[PDB]
A paper describes a structure:
pmcThe mature HIV-1 capsid is a conical, fullerene shell that encompasses the viral genome. The surface of the conical capsid is dense in protein-binding sites that mediate interactions with host machinery necessary for transport of the capsid through the cytoplasm into the nucleus.
To investigate what effect the hexamer–pentamer switch and the tilt switch have on host–protein binding, we next repeated our structural analysis on cores incubated with FG repeat containing peptides Nup153(1407-1429), CPSF6(276-290), and Sec24C(228-242). We determined structures of hexamers from peptide-bound cores to nominal resolutions of 2.6 Å, 3.1 Å, and 3.1 Å and associated pentamers to 3.1 Å, 3.5 Å, and 3.2 Å, respectively. In contrast, we do not detect any density corresponding to peptides bound to pentamers, though in all three cases, peptide density is visible in the binding pocket of the hexamers immediately adjacent to the pentamers. The first switch alters the FG repeat binding pocket between the hexamer and pentamer, precluding FG repeat binding to the pentamer completely. Our structures in the presence of host peptides show that this change prevents binding of FG repeat peptides from Nup153, CPSF6, and Sec24C to this pocket in the pentamer.
Author numbering:
A (entry chain B), B (entry chain C), H (entry chain C), I (entry chain B), J (entry chain C), K (entry chain C), ...: 148 to 221
C (entry chain A), D (entry chain A), E (entry chain A), F (entry chain A), G (entry chain A): 1 to 86, 96 to 221
Amino acid sequence: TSILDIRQGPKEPFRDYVDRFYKTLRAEQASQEVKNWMTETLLVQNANPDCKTILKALGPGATLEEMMTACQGV
Amino acid sequence: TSILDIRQGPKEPFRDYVDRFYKTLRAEQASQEVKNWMTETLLVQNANPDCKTILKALGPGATLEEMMTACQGV
Amino acid sequence: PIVQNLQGQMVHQAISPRTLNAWVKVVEEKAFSPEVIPMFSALSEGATPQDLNTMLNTVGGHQAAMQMLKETINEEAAEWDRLHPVMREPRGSDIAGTTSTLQEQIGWMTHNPPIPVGEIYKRWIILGLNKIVRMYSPTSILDIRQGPKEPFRDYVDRFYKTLRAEQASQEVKNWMTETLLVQNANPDCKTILKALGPGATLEEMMTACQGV
Amino acid sequence: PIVQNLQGQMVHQAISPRTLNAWVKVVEEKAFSPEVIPMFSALSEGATPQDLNTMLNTVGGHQAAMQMLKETINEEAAEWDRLHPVMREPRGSDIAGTTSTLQEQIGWMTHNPPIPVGEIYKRWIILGLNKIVRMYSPTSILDIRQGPKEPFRDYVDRFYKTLRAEQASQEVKNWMTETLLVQNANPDCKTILKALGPGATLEEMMTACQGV
Amino acid sequence: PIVQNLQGQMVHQAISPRTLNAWVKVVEEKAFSPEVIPMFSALSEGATPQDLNTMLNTVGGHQAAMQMLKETINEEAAEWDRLHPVMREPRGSDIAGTTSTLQEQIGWMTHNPPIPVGEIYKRWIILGLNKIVRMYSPTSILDIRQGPKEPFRDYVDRFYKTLRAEQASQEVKNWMTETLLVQNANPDCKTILKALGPGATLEEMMTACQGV
Amino acid sequence: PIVQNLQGQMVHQAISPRTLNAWVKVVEEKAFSPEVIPMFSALSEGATPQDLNTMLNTVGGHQAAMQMLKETINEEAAEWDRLHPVMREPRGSDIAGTTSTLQEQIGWMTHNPPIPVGEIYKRWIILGLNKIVRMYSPTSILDIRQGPKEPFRDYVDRFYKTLRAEQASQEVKNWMTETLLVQNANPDCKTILKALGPGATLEEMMTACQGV
Amino acid sequence: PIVQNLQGQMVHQAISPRTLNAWVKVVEEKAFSPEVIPMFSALSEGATPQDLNTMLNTVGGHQAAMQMLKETINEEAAEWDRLHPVMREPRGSDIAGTTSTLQEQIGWMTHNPPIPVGEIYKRWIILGLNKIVRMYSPTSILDIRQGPKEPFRDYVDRFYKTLRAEQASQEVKNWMTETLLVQNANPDCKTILKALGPGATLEEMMTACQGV
Amino acid sequence: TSILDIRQGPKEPFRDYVDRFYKTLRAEQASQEVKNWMTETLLVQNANPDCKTILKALGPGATLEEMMTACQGV
Amino acid sequence: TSILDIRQGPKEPFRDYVDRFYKTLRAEQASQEVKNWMTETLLVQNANPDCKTILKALGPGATLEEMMTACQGV
Amino acid sequence: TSILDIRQGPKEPFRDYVDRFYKTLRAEQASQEVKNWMTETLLVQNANPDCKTILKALGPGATLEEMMTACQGV
Amino acid sequence: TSILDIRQGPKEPFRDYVDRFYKTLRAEQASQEVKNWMTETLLVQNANPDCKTILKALGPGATLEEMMTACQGV
Amino acid sequence: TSILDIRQGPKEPFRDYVDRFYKTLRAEQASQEVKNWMTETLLVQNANPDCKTILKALGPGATLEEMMTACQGV
Amino acid sequence: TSILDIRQGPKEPFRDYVDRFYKTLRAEQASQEVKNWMTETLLVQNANPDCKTILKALGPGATLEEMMTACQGV
Amino acid sequence: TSILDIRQGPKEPFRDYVDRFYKTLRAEQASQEVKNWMTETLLVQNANPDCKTILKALGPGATLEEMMTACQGV
Amino acid sequence: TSILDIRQGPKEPFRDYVDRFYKTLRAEQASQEVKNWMTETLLVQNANPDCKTILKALGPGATLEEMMTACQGV
């Protein structure tokens, strides 16, 4: 699995998806600005729709803390 | 249509509603203090229930760029 | 307040216990509806900054309201020092009455011409109370709509009450009373309010809508 | 108001903070029902034009009411100058207390005979408050009808309250109390009110309709 | 009212603005229920005829009530001149305070022994207010009946309130409280009120009917 | 009340018109609920017997209440003469202020040590008002039961209000608050009030029953 | 309170009869809701311990409340003697005003610098009133939940009112307003209050929830 | 019957009711101030709905002669 | 028709009956006291019952003005 | 009919109602201050719902010429 | 049974109820001021509806001899 | 009939029974203390039950006036 | 089409009728007072009934601005 | 779960609820004044209806040892 | 029966069980600390469940008075 094809399932809790995403990101180990892009754009774009709407409600530039505490009810 | 009648439909994209709103706001050509008030309060109040909560979460300081960026995912 | 002594000197008279209890009834029972600003302005009327602090100690029970007052008073004291760079000089915290003595406050209020540090601080307080009154508004003006069988007098009262709570400058208020007040009327009144045309004063609107 | 100093000179005493708060409660809580005119006339009782302006600053929150007062005061000041063409002379804006000093107002109020610039300006204000009370009337007198099970005392109270808000001269009021009050009664009372004949006083009407 | 000056002379102090506003609240808000007589008698307490006229100017808004006062005052002034045929003499219209100067009123009130023209005129006014309170009664005493589940305390309150509005002399009042109060009770209370027998005081009636 | 004159002599100041109107509002509007005793005791606070008679003249409209006051005052004046057999001597009817001059009352109140004829007569009046408050109680304490969904704070308020109207000595009151207050609670509260055991203070009872 | 005599000496003026009646209305009619502390603090404002005892004699009708005051006053008087071991010395029961003369109280309040035995005893009383206000709370803060159609302004008012009755220190209050106020909101408001994030001030919470 | 129980029947002539009223009033023999009050107010209040309006139209000053003269036509 | 046999019909308005009555009275032209008796007694006695009750509610001695304004609703 | 009973029918022309109103106003012959009040307020209040709104839109200053001119089209 | 639970049955003789009441009052052995209050008020309030009215008619001053003498006929 | 066997019927008004009782007592003309006993005890004991309860509600020693006014509703 | 026969249809918005009217008036180019008459009288008389009533509610002499803003809801 | 969501089930042992409560209280790691408040008030308020009454009967001073000792029998 | 096998029945009132318990304890006459243990532990443990819960609601160390007054409603 590339980081590009890690995706959140319908039932999958956001914290499980985030852990899969960042483990894949850590292994795939692209350069820092590619990691910035992936953690800002792919992390949201590959979230499931119910998380993706809650994430975009935060506006870009939020921390991972704020993203996880936001999605924790989904 | 008066600007007070420009209301976002339940499935209408926020960008299409903003386009209608600011077109009507330009046609009505109320003075700038009134336009400022309308862009700050009325644009939010007339958004549909999906977008309206996103816009409130940005706070009154939101800029039209931020408002559209956030609502683009609805 | 300030009174003349029998020796002719200006001297402090403490704000009376029932004037303070009247202000307590205003702060407690009115929940910062807009009446709380005229009633403050009235009960404060002669007040020195020491007396005004004695009044604000009542708002100190509403810790959320009290910090907005503290903020706006600190803000205006700083801006005062900013516009007025340095019989001592009336500095911002001296006008607030934290720094100044009572004799300094009365002195400022009784030089010729006086420096009205009471009325100044009272104006900073009223600007803070305006923020609090705005926060405690139950509705925005866009939520105020006339009922299907509600008198136009009641709807006008609700409208102007809400309009008076809100931040709107006079130009925005004028636009609201000209256009929201018509738009948000019930259809029976809205017909007449349109038929008068846009140049109608509130008197003409009300006397036309009377009993509808 | 005016008081005697210990030196025997007439001098200003400021209108008390709780008298102002009483007037604020009148302006705010009564929504310009006709009670607001007797209560103004009472709380104003000793007032100089400076004090009357301090009271009108309370109405300044009701910008629609306040401009009717400004209008009627400017109108009466102009008409005063028109009837009274020119120890200085009391001009219209001097009676309003925009132009005059406090010492000028008290002087006029304490010459022999005095010029009662307080009671004059107070009368122009009461004429403006009459306009405002009329605008805020919930109903016209023709809308006041008795309920099918409403006491005639309640209906008389509603009627005379509305009659007291309206512009009617005393001749028109007399016709209304003689004929509308009968016409708009419920049929049970209307029978008795007719059977008394047209020359019945309100006392005779009420004591006949008592408990119906 | 009358006060002692620092020079020792008796002198007029004008009836205070909030005492007048208290009287306005009595006249306006209580609709001439019987409370309006004790409250008049209280707020009037020190009043000269000039002050009493300043109070009656409040009733002048209720033109039907005001003419009953004018009538009863003219009637009693005439009867005063009739019983008292002629440091000037206190004539009826002088006691009314239309004819007399303020200094004449205070003089009469401060001769030794005084002529209490204030308390006299105040008594004629209270006799007029009694007529008005009677006219505004919502019910006659014969209409006052206890509800099927109404406390005897509430019914006694309603009864004595109505009894206090009515024209009944004390002998007629005594008969009413002895017999109507029993007759018009609900059957549960009426049983006990009969079982006490006719010589029962109101205390004995109430404590027996308590909680029924 | 009594005040110091500028000449240093103690002198009468008449009980103020709005203090009398405050007492009228207490007598009229509260229907002798137990609040009427603290409010009497407060408004009376400085009163001479002349002033206390001026207050009782307000109760004179409630002829049933007024005769209980007359009775209790005559009773206590007689018992005063009985305990105190005979700068004149303060006799019972002199303390009542029917017999004594105003100067005699103030003299007694300002000898060294004083005879507090005001506070004495005020205590006889309060004993009469206690009888009247007891008569006007809507319920006996045995009738006070908690509703099935009534807060224990409301029930405690109703209970202690009724307990405060009744004749119970402090020992009987203590037994009532210990046992009736539990017995008459609803079953939800009654369970907890029993589980605390009999030695529970009202604070412990209320904080346990809070929100039940 | 304390006033300056015409001879320049500080002297007692008794707490006015209508200030006492205002305090009676606070104790009687408000049932120890938290307003009773600001209103005490206001009406007390100039009070000597003799005056404060005259105010507490009003609470003496609420024997359960009065013993909590007695307790807290005795407790603080003992702790005062404990921190302050022994122009006489102000001992605890002297500050309570059981032991001290009136002249001793005014002396302490007018030495240079003064010992503010009035404001001290007033602070012990306010600590007792806080205990009583807490006992009479109708609900704990955990019981305060928003209704399904209740304005967030009303719910905030209920919440902060209850929060103000409770014993919570400011750190616990801060946690409550940050987290209970969100948790106990209805789901419509709770969504927005969560979407603002945890760092939201009450102003930001209210203006976002306005009209929901 | 007390005087308060003496009430005019719906078809009873006013003269027969007055005869019952003043007979009962003589039997009860209340003092003259109370009798005056009863003859003035209670005699009117206890009349039937037909006569009661006639009596009110005469005003409180009506004399028993005038009251009976007026009600004779009912 | 004698004045004695002029009578108001069931549907006849009072003013029409009064005009018939006074025209007959004017023609029959009895002496003044007989006219007084007829205008006070026959005028009421020959009114229809609904007018006759309203007339007797006025009490004798009323003017013809007051009699007509009273009956005008019948 | 009193002037207070003169009310415009739902299909009645405003000119026919004005003719009835001013005929009744002339018959009642109330004093001129009362007539002025009736012509200003009561003529408007008694108009039918179609005309009444037209008359209110002219304001209280309307003259009978203007009132009739405006209502001629109903 | 507490004394507050001792209540007279609808057909129970007043003497049998008094026997139960004063037996329970002796067992509870509350202090004499409380006993006095209970004998004066509670004994009356707990009587059945037939006897309770008899006891109230004697007034608060009734003595147990008088109370029993009166209720013996129920 | 002896005074001992004079008794009130079920429908008999108390005043009729009292008149029969005291006429029999007057004729039978026992000594004064026997009359006292009969007028206090037999008069109540031979009343019908509805009167007898109302009489005992008065307590012994009442006058005949009070006994008759009490029973007058039965 | 003469200006005399330009007429508003049932569904036709007032602004479309006004534009047809004034284009025809501009082409037909009668003298100024005839144009005044046509723009005041024919413009209203040839409006459809729902507009014609709203126009006459304005009273004669209104501007074309006020006429168009008035009819814009029809 | 927040500590405010930790509520005792109707059949859940008080020791198992306390274990959940103090585990969540340790995880949330609010400052000690807030923990003190939660252990004193919230632990009681969130108990089930059986245990809650037991805990209230111990008073606010109860210690967790005493609270558990008492509720062990539920 | 040993004190160990004295037990409260389902219907048995607590005072009857306590009397059986303490009579058995008095006869079996174990040493004082064994009696302390039995009166604290066995007395509660052998109570019926409805009493046992009410007893444990008191917390250990209560007097026998408080235990009996507590269970008296069961």
